[PDB]
Design a binder for these strands. Structure first.
Ligand SMILES: [K+]
Ligand SMILES: [K+]
Ligand SMILES: [K+]
Ligand SMILES: [K+]
Ligand SMILES: [K+]
Ligand SMILES: [K+]
Ligand SMILES: [K+]
Ligand SMILES: [K+]
Ligand SMILES: [K+]
Ligand SMILES: [K+]
Ligand SMILES: [K+]
Ligand SMILES: [Mg+2]
Ligand SMILES: [Mg+2]
Ligand SMILES: [Mg+2]
Ligand SMILES: [Mg+2]
Ligand SMILES: [Mg+2]
Ligand SMILES: [Mg+2]
Ligand SMILES: [Mg+2]
Ligand SMILES: [Mg+2]
Ligand SMILES: [Mg+2]
Ligand SMILES: [Mg+2]
Ligand SMILES: [Mg+2]
Ligand SMILES: [Mg+2]
Ligand SMILES: [Mg+2]
Ligand SMILES: [Mg+2]
Ligand SMILES: [Mg+2]
Ligand SMILES: [Mg+2]
Ligand SMILES: [Mg+2]
Ligand SMILES: [Mg+2]
Ligand SMILES: [Mg+2]
Ligand SMILES: [Mg+2]
Ligand SMILES: [Mg+2]
Ligand SMILES: [Mg+2]
Ligand SMILES: [Mg+2]
Ligand SMILES: [Mg+2]
Ligand SMILES: [Mg+2]
Ligand SMILES: [Mg+2]
Ligand SMILES: [Mg+2]
Ligand SMILES: [Mg+2]
Lengths: 127, 98, 206, 100, 84, 153
RNA sequence: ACCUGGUCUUGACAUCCACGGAAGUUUUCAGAGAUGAGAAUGUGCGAACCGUGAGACAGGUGCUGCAUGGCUGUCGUCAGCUCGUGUUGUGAAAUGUUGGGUUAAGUCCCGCAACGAGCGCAACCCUUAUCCUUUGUUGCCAGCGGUCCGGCCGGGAACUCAAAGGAGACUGCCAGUGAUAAACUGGAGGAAGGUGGGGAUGACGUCAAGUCAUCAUGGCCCUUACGACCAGGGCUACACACGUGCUACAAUGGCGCAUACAAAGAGAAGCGACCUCGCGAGAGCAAGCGGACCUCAUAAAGUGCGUCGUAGUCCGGAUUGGAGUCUGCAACUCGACUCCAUGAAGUCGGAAUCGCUAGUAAUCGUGGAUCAGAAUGCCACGGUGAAUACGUUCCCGGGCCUU
């Protein structure tokens, strides 16, 4: 049947649907190479598949919202990993060994009073 | 169908009104859809605390407006008159739409 | 240094608001200004009625004022005569139908606003500031407070150099958010200027 | 603020309502694309005759409790100082110290 | 500057002052505080005395002063250089 | 830091070649967080370098590193009296970090057209012990040579 | 709040009394206006509301922050600061609070003439990272069924999400180490591991620190004036010196075309679509929205293709001329923005000096408060996304013991 995974990264969240196939990937009704023009983003998306050796045994249906290129690419990689574990449960050990199961919780630090940014202070002068 | 939109500064006070709006409605015939938790608004304010200078010394405040949506589909006749006379608690804004 | 207001920091945690209505931007500023004029009148009229807290609500095109007090008979008067005299002034000010409710402050020795006002009236009568603060602290500790702190600042005893003095008994854990800390202030207008009083009263963690 | 300065704003608020409709139709003429060229001229000259204090741009928001002309906040009608005092006393509904 | 669809601005009290003196031979200086008034093609000749904050300075209106405001001919600040 | 609580951060391997070594070099070259702009510059210079020699992009890159990596450097050491520039052994990781930083710094100083060409001419001279970067490695070895007497402080 | 001139004196703002008058509307002249003189119309429902006349008084952003309250900065989010009883000392004082370990921590354990307690630390609060339950529109689209291919429609409650209630992390588990202690080092499981990240939270006190111009207030001072009203000017001056920023000096770029991916927020005297007109800022017409619905509102960096080819340039955009738009009684002094033309310094900055340890710095856009109009400031939001930390001798600030 269909297998599902929810992935999140920065302000992005990806819905992933995994089913046996031949290796075709759709992201927001576009192809992988059409959606992600950045070469790093394409490698991030694939990374779980090159690891478990199920690259061309599956079909990927994926919708994403929010964030940017690297966030969505990373968000898909997380939800993909959560889909494969709903597929086979013996993959958790090798996926976690690759750092793919962890939800990356790094977010933008808020701007604070008296600072120019989250941490950049205004220029100081003794006199 | 009539639309029920509920506003309040306290989400505990807003759940009391919703719990008694969807209770004085299923009894009196009509059935209900919801309640729906619409997105809370967060209005923010930043003020200088010192009466004079000290620009970096500030207090940051916030008012949260909670929102609720209740759908009374197929309103019976005993249902309608059983709504304006409920008299909800203070600090709960109620808007009736048709 | 400077400390956060003990009431404000707990307003959603263990302390309730003193005004509990809802309004959009269109009338939010006008409701605040009418609450101000109402409290300004009630506080001046009921100066000798031990008014601790004036809570204002606005159900629907009407205002409901709840006066917490320790001398309710003085607030009400004979057969509800006086409480009626205010129910008219409040409607005049608020511009909506008015309704007044009288709450009971039992043990005024455990209410920060009343304790602060007690000390302040004594200072305007030229009572020794030291005697007033000790009495207030001993009273509240005897009635079962878990702690109390009283602070007095200004030209104490008409001294030329102003200073601050404070006493404390029991626990007053101001950094614990879930601590029931009743806090209020008051001002005395002596012949040498203003003396400020602050009172913290701890009643147990919730 | 001084008492005189407070009374200057109540006058400017009254005069802005008494001449409200009389000011709006004059600018209707002046802004009118297909009016004439001499009534426009008359409407322009007539607008200058109304007292200056009748224009809403002559008003300055002031703290409703002190009269302070700086640090105003429209949602509360108070200066930044009085907003803080009322907020900590719990006299502003729903308003608490924010943190995110 | 002022939008063309509104025409140049003129203070109405000054417009009466130039009317009552172009038809007559009044060569007396016109004392005005209306530095905001555009100079019109109708008082090329007489002297308007414009206020600069502390007195009225006479400007002899010619043709080339048309389109300018009166204040452009009455400087408000007094400068002579530092240590000069 | 005083407390020594600083572990290590994982770096992704570069896309085209899967070399973490090369991915750090893109990072040293990157400005303003524009990583893709730096990825392209490195790839173009690497191909000009791959056809200027017979080796692959990597083997030509390593040969450039081997001629720029310093082995010993000098660090100051204030002790009871004055400060001597003590020669210290450069740890294997810092060897690569210094080699890359000097290459990128030397290439930015040239006067060719693009940065992809400048980086190519520096990576090529580094294979022949010419140009800056390689010279910077020579100046460091000389300083550490003239201070070998202080090799116990 | 200042200046010049024009003006008032129980008074612009209160109360009291006397007397006049409903209050209001509608126009004329003089004057820069304040104001003065009128001239019409209403006279309703005492007491509203106006005018005048007296004197108690009002009024003061006038002085003293070294008379004060309140509020704030600061050492410093540093780990400290104390008290009761006991004991020691003629006494000031000491002990506790020191010691052995340990911790981010006066954190904890052990010892101990101390035994206990308080204020601080931590915890309780907000937020962010995982999951569950409920609810399913204005939000959602997996399987369906149609389709103008638009979740567009029928439906669907799965999912993303919205917001309520729960679950979760405790050095709990395992091993070693250690004084059979506190703890530490590492491993497992897990979204998260040792205070998970960020915020709020500021002990006793210090600087007679800041604020009598937010407000309040003792005292002092002015009262036909230091009070009040008006017009114009000033706070925008300019040999110069400093602080904080913005934009650059270019090719990791400029310009042209095409083409992706955000978060957060605001709106009724408001936000304003569509359409048409304008080179453009805008204009006319006019929907929708008190909003998960409508509007603001195209994110930009990015990517593809072209071009420029190292030049004071197709870099840079200061300055100035001309012509306009919009807000507003009114843009001369002194507004923002648009168009055409002009095309300054500047080619990486002396001595010196500042910020930052990770989603940080750097860089890229977006919003909001104030506000008729008027941000390169402030407050907030996401996109991209580094380098480096061997170590604690030195510089600066601080903590503990000792001399
Ligand atoms: K003070
Ligand atoms: K002794
Ligand atoms: K003792
Ligand atoms: K004073
Ligand atoms: K001015
Ligand atoms: K700036
Ligand atoms: K140029
Ligand atoms: K201007
Ligand atoms: K510089
Ligand atoms: K504005
Ligand atoms: K010492
Ligand atoms: Mg950012
Ligand atoms: Mg909203
Ligand atoms: Mg005053
Ligand atoms: Mg204004
Ligand atoms: Mg004068
Ligand atoms: Mg002081
Ligand atoms: Mg003794
Ligand atoms: Mg100590
Ligand atoms: Mg001691
Ligand atoms: Mg010890
Ligand atoms: Mg402790
Ligand atoms: Mg001990
Ligand atoms: Mg704490
Ligand atoms: Mg289908
Ligand atoms: Mg572990
Ligand atoms: Mg603070
Ligand atoms: Mg001082
Ligand atoms: Mg001073
Ligand atoms: Mg002063
Ligand atoms: Mg003026
Ligand atoms: Mg200024
Ligand atoms: Mg250019
Ligand atoms: Mg706005
Ligand atoms: Mg030059
Ligand atoms: Mg050049
Ligand atoms: Mg740090
Ligand atoms: Mg920016
Ligand atoms: Mg310590």
């Amino acid at each position: 049947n269909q297998y599902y995974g929810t992935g999140r990264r920065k302000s992005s969240a990806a819905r992933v649907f995994i089913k046996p196939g031949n290796g075709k990937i759709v992201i927001n009704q576009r192809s992988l190479e059409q959606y992600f023009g950045r070469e790093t983003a394409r490698m991030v998306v694939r990374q779980p598949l090159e690891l478990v050796d199920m690259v061309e045994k599956l079909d990927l249906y994926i919708t994403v919202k929010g964030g940017g290129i690297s966030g969505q690419a990373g968000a898909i990689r997380h939800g993909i990993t959560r889909a494969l574990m709903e597929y086979d449960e013996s993959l958790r050990s090798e996926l976690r060994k690759a750092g793919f199961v962890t939800r990356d919780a790094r977010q933008v630090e808020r701007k604070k009073v008296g600072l120019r940014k989250a941490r950049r202070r205004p220029q100081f002068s003794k006199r | 169908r009539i639309r029920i939109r509920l506003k309040a500064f306290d989400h505990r006070l807003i759940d009391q009104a919703t719990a008694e709006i969807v209770e004085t409605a299923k009894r009196t015939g009509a059935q209900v859809r919801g309640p729906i938790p619409l997105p809370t608004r967060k209005e923010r304010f930043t003020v200088l605390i010192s009466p004079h200078v000290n620009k970096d010394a500030r207090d940051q405040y916030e008012i949260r407006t909670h929102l609720r949506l209740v759908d009374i589909v197929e309103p019976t006749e005993k249902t309608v008159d059983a709504l304006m006379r409920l008299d909800l608690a203070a600090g709960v804004d109620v808007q009736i739409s048709l | 240094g400077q400390k956060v207001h003990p009431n404000g920091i707990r307003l959603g945690i263990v302390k309730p608001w003193n005004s509990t209505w809802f309004a959009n931007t269109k009338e939010f500023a006008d409701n605040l200004d009418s609450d101000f004029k109402v409290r300004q009148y009630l506080t001046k009229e009921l100066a000798k009625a031990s008014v601790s807290r004036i809570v204002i609500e606005r159900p629907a095109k009407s205002i409901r004022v709840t006066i917490h007090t320790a001398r309710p008979g003085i607030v009400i008067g004979k057969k509800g005569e006086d409480v009626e005299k205010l129910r008219k002034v409040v409607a005049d000010i608020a511009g909506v139908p008015a309704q007044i409710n009288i709450a009971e402050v039992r043990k005024p020795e455990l209410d920060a606003k009343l304790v602060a006002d007690s000390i302040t009236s004594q200072l305007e009568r030229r009572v020794m500031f030291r005697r007033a603060m000790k009495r207030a602290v001993q009273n509240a500790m005897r009635l079962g407070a878990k702690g109390i702190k009283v602070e007095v600042s200004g030209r104490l005893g008409g001294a030329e150099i102003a200073r601050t003095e404070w006493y404390r008994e029991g626990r007053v854990p101001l950094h614990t958010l879930r601590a029931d800390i009743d806090y209020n202030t008051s001002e005395a207008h002596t012949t040498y200027g203003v003396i400020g009083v602050k009172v913290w009263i701890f009643k147990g963690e919730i | 603020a001084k008492q005189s300065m407070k009374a200057r704003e109540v006058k400017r608020v009254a005069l802005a309502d008494k001449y409200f409709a009389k000011r709006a139709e004059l600018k209707a003429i002046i802004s009118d694309v297909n009016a004439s060229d001499e009534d426009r001229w008359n409407a322009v000259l007539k607008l200058q005759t109304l007292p200056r204090d009748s224009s809403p741009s002559r008003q300055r928001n002031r703290c409703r409790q002190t009269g302070r002309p700086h640090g105003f906040l429209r949602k509360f009608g108070l200066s930044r100082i009085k907003v803080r005092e009322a907020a900590m006393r719990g006299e502003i509904p729903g308003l608490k110290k924010a943190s995110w | 500057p002022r939008s063309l669809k509104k025409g140049p601005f003129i203070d109405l009290h000054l417009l009466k002052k130039v009317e009552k003196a172009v038809e007559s031979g009044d060569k007396k200086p016109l004392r005005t505080w209306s530095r905001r008034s555009t100079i019109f093609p109708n008082m090329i000749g007489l002297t308007i005395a414009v206020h600069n904050g502390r007195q009225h300075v006479p400007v002899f209106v010619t043709d080339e002063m048309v389109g300018h405001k009166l204040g452009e001919f009455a400087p408000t600040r007094t400068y002579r250089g530092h240590a000069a | 830091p005083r407390r020594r609580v600083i572990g290590q951060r994982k770096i992704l391997p570069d896309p085209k070649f899967g070399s973490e070594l090369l991915a750090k070099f893109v990072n040293i070259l990157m400005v303003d967080g524009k990583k893709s702009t730096a990825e392209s510059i490195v790839y173009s210079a690497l191909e000009t370098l791959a056809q200027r020699s017979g080796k692959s992009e990597l083997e030509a890159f390593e040969v450039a590193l081997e001629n720029v990596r310093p082995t010993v450097e000098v660090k100051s050491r204030r002790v009871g009296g004055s400060t001597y520039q003590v020669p210290v052994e450069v740890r294997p990781v810092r060897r690569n970090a210094l080699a890359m930083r000097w290459i990128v710094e030397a290439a930015r100083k040239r006067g060719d057209k693009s940065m992809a060409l400048r980086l190519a001419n520096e990576l090529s001279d580094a294979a022949e012990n010419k140009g800056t970067a390689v010279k910077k490695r020579e100046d460091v070895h000389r300083m550490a040579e003239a201070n070998k007497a202080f090799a116990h402080y």
